[PDB]
Amino acid sequence: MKRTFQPSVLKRNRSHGFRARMATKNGRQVLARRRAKGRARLTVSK
Amino acid sequence: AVVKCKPTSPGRRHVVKVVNPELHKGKPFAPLLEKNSKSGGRNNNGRITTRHIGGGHKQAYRIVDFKRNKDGIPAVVERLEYDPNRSANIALVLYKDGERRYILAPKGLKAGDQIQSGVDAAIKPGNTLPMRNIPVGSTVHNVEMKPGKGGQLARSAGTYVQIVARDGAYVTLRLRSGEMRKVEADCRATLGEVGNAEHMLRVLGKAGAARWRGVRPTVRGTAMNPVDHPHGGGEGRNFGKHPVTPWGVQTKGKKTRSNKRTDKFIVRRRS
RNA sequence: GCUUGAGUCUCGUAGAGGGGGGUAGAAUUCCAGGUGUAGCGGUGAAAUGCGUAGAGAUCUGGAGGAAUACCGGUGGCGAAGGCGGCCCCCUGGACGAAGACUGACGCUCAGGUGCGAAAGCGUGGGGAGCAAACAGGAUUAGAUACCCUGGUAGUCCACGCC
RNA sequence: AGGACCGAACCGACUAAUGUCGAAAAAUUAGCGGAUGACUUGUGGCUGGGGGUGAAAGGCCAAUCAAACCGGGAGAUAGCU
RNA sequence: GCUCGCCGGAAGACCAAGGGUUCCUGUCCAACGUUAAUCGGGGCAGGGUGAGUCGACCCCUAAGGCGAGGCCGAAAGGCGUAGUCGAUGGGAAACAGGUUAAUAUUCCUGUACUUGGUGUUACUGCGAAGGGGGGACGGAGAAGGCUAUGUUGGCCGGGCGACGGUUGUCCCGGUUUAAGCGUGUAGGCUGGUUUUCCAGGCAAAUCCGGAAAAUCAAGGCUGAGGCGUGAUGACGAGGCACUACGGUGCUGAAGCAACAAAUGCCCUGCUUCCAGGAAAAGCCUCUAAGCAUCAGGUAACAUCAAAUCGUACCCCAAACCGACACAGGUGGUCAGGUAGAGAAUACCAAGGCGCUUGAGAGAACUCGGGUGAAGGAACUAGGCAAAAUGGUGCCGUAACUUCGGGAGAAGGCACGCUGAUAUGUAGGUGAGGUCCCUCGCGGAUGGAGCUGAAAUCAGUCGAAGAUACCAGCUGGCUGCAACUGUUUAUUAAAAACACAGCACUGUGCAAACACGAAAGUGGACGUAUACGGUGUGACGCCUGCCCGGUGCCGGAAGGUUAAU
RNA sequence: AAUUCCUUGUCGGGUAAGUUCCGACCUGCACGAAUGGCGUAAUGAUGGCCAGGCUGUCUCCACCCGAGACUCAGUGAAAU
RNA sequence: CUUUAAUGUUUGAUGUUCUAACGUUGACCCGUAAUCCGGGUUGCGGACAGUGUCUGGUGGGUAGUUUGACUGGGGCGGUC
RNA sequence: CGCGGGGUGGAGCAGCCUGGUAGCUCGUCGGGCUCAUAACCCGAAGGUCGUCGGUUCAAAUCCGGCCCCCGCAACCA
Ligand SMILES: *C(=O)[C@H](CCSC)NC=O
């Protein structure tokens, strides 16, 4: 059985990265909402 | 030649092969080979538009001439080749100036024959001439629609057009399927039937003997569930709806001939 | 060894002998168009069928296929089946004449090999006419027959089989 | 030569047994089929909700699918408990 | 520390992925560990990651994404050109040994290589987002030539041995050496050099390509390995000498021969077949706009520089992914001895571990297995489960058939050890020796050494000799589906699906059709011997009657009939 | 008969005994020609049946070797 | 009134021709080393095609809903 | 159990719905044609309308009871 989750930094950051959000308007909403909430880990990064 | 292979195994048992003892078994000319990544039938968005497309074998495209634009210069059929994405073979000819370029392969042709285009090229299989210099009742191929576009009609193995008449600026053709189109008089054609004349008798024998070519298994409509296709479902193989396509359009007899701006050029449709 | 068997060579004869490739006209059919009008077609009679949307008849043009009138003759040719519009190309057989040359190289032949109408079959083309099967209409005690209107394979083409 | 044969790797998952608060939210053990192919698999992209994908089971789309997940309409509605 | 046991194509040793200090040392034991625990992947403090040659970054592109203008779209935004990103791909360069508690082709020792900057000297035409060559390529299969590496022998060092023999064909341990430089071999590709000419390469061209003669038959390119060198060097079993008894300092013989041999290399070859097998830059070549006492380019030489990031450890697992120290999943590489065809399997080596609860007991019962009198499916929904058949060579083998098969059909025979043929054969490799030569890594020739099946005969032993593990149950009638294959992940692998084949039918190209409100794409850079839809399902023998109802196609006169 | 309710239809074979199976009879509830018909070499982790081999499947179990169950010390859940 | 004939006039309905609207996924050139695109040539179609408003037809391709109750349980039947 | 339909000369079918009147084909009988038969031609005859009751001026017909016959249904667990 292959557990439904294999890690891959490159692939992760190309779909959940900071710039993975800034390329679209929707991402600008997500960056806004998480900031509106007061979250600390906005997106998987350094 | 045609050879029904020996029944050494179930799957090979029903294969018939096209053994061509002429085609150059070396590697083709590089400068006329460009990349050609298959697309499995997916559009710009990425969704599959046409079904049964994909897999296949990695192939490279052979850019060939269609125009026969460099006129007045004779040529020699240096050698024949094999083309993956055609039906007919292609030949690498050489102009007298020293420029090699591919052209399709007409029926009766050997490596070392003479071919040329323009208007001075005589009546021999391979010469390209505008249709106002071609005899009525002749067999041609690679017929153009517009002068200079290149050639569209009759391009596969043994597909030939019989010129009917030449009234005014409208020359009449009789297509391979059976439709009388009337085209521009300056449309360039090429004498003789296209080569690879045994292509029709070739059978595959295997499911894989079609798979590496590019097709995908065709699922019948009656097997699918009613939410998928306008047929199918039912406890125990039922049917009874009017045969259609995956989108409701009645098939098995339903004309969709509608372009209308080409209505003027079509004299007779398929019987 | 000879020459009357048989065979080769020089010159010619007539011929639907055969294979491949071109081409011509009458006729039929179909399609488009003009003229024009109620029947047309068919049979023993009739009906099926076609027709006032406008057939057939008649005139013009075009697209295909098959078969080659008269010549044609119990004529000719080939082993036979079989083969006839004309033409070019490749090519086979027989026969006639004056001599020569080889010098019995012969006659026949189970098995073996090949050719072998049509119908019929495989593969891929072609489809006018004709036409199994089949349908319809009649005749008939009955008629899945003769007769009538349609009609698929087929007949046609190349490679094979039989 | 082969969608050819035998058979490990590898992939898959036919019978039985164990297990069922298990070692494990489908596995282990003994045996099975493919095993040069329509083969297998890594890295990287693409197709997305009445949409995708499908050698087609209404199977699959993050342990969830006869229409995913999250937030919002919304304290939906209930002659029902 | 001494025995015992287990894996050993792994439970071993290294990279990638991913973790994130889990690595080492000292100290501590409440909590964590399914037990205690002075122990530890636990807490606490400290230490550890050293690069011009490894990788990333960088230059260059694939799929595909973003996309100036631009086209389209109610807005958002969609598509896409020029461009620019994007490795799993291509592209410059280092090997061996030593060292620390923990890092090393990164530090030290020795010996080398690559790319640019600048300067000097002697020559000399250089010069692009442009052209050309090159990079640059399929699967499968076979042979030859080698190496990695292992065994054997000689040689060197040690022992002659706690129960019987063992100074001998005895036993134990060792016998390792790279990159770079030089040579250019086995072998592979291809006819070279020269004169002239040209509507070809969106311009030019001395470059390629084409077309004619001249001259000679080689030149050139590529190229594993070996041999020398690297190296009177390092390493090195074993001693010598100090122990904080952890280890260190010192010293140090031989270091060759032969055979067997890979899936590594030559081979990004060769032969063949088809389903016909990235692109670009680096690199080299050629000239244009031009610039030419120049500048630049080339060769040699001196010298400078090559940054930044990662580097510990785990990586078939108590550290990844599964809530856990979880019998699960996880790509790549190296991969020794004997038996054996083999990476199977049995037992071992290097190496790493004894699975984180143990001690007695020897009941029922359950799980995992061993054997079993007589019979032999009488069990049972059913021979499910077990039992059993199980290797090689050889002999032999039916119905049916598409003439390939069925077939490993079925069914049998010899299998051990020892001697002999033969103080080990056929066969293989093959020195010394001899002659030859376009003189070298050469050719005939020569044959010792080394190595080594099978077969035949005889003798002999056990109840049993393919002695273990490993390792087909066979056969007859017959339904269905042609057969390979695919699918209900997680109760259904099947007669279901698919399949090649056939048939109907749509499609004349801005093709039908499909996604998309559109543009634009896919279809196809294909075009009727093509492509889409549908039904059926190899192949063989075929495929009858019905156009009433529905649908489709053809036909339009008339009736009815919408907006206008 | 993957199709036949009545039916286990009738006859024949296989068995000591055969609602299954093989082969035929047509009385086809309600088969049938590309929602393809009837055969078919080979193949199938497929479906039904018989024969041989073979055995603890069974007659009818007994003993044997390990993991637990039982006891001792340590740790210490669960549905309800 | 009807039948008819010439003209004027009224728009309508066919056929052919033309070029300027327009289409051009035809060739060439330039913006530009750019197969998108824009513009300029020129050829071919051509007042068609195509798009928009209105309109009949077809329409499970898609969508929102309906599909009664009584019933000695519901269904069928019967019934209101 | 229930729904629908059918029963008519010797046989097979009209007629019923919308009541007073029963027709068609074959077959039987008789004659003719023929040497004789079939076929053909001409002519004539034959029905309690399954059974019973009722409503009605009048019933094969319209209603209800009964028998026979055909199809459908006879169900979900
Ligand atoms: C009826 O038979 C019923 C169906 C149950 S489906 C879960 N079964 C009764 O035992």
Side-chain angles (χ1 to χ4, degrees), chain B residues 178-234:
Chain B
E179 296 89 314
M180 309 285 267
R181 282 203 76 207
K182 285 213 169 194
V183 296
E184 201 72 41
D186 309 321
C187 291
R188 300 187 168 196
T190 312
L191 279 173
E193 289 197 52
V194 198
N196 210 299
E198 64 275 19
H199 190 75
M200 179 163 269
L201 286 72
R202 175 214 299 168
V203 295
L204 315 179
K206 298 169 52 178
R211 270 297 293 284
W212 41 46
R213 189 148 303 123
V215 284
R216 175 64 44 70
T218 296
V219 195
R220 298 172 305 162
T222 56
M224 319 159 96
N225 282 303
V227 54
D228 299 309
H229 200 234
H231 297 121

Side-chain angles (χ1 to χ4, degrees), chain B residues 248-260:
Chain B
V249 173
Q250 165 77 28
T251 311
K252 300 277 283 186
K254 183 72 176 65
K255 296 187 162 56
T256 70
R257 162 55 179 163
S258 178
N259 211 13
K260 291 170 61 183

Side-chain angles (χ1 to χ4, degrees), chain B residues 103-183:
Chain B
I103 63 157
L104 310 181
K107 192 179 193 178
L109 192 72
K110 88 163 305 306
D113 287 315
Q114 284 296 138
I115 59 164
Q116 45 176 48
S117 64
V119 295
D120 198 68
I123 314 302
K124 281 183 290 295
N127 299 109
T128 295
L129 306 168
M131 288 198 255
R132 51 192 179 186
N133 306 76
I134 307 180
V136 165
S138 50
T139 287
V140 292
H141 67 278
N142 194 269
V143 185
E144 291 203 59
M145 307 295 236
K146 301 296 177 181
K149 194 155 77 172
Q152 306 260 318
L153 315 179
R155 301 201 322 172
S156 64
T159 59
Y160 63 115
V161 178
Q162 198 181 328
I163 304 174
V164 190
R166 190 175 50 195
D167 195 294
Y170 277 155
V171 65
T172 309
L173 324 166
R174 188 160 85 172
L175 289 160
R176 185 49 195 171
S177 52
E179 296 89 314
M180 309 285 267
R181 282 203 76 207
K182 285 213 169 194
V183 296

Side-chain angles (χ1 to χ4, degrees), chain B residues 11-34:
Chain B
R12 153 69 93 175
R13 184 170 308 207
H14 290 301
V15 306
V16 80
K17 196 166 298 298
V18 172
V19 49
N20 213 321
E22 325 294 317
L23 315 188
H24 172 56
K25 304 154 193 173
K27 280 183 179 175
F29 182 65
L32 287 197
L33 281 177
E34 299 284 16

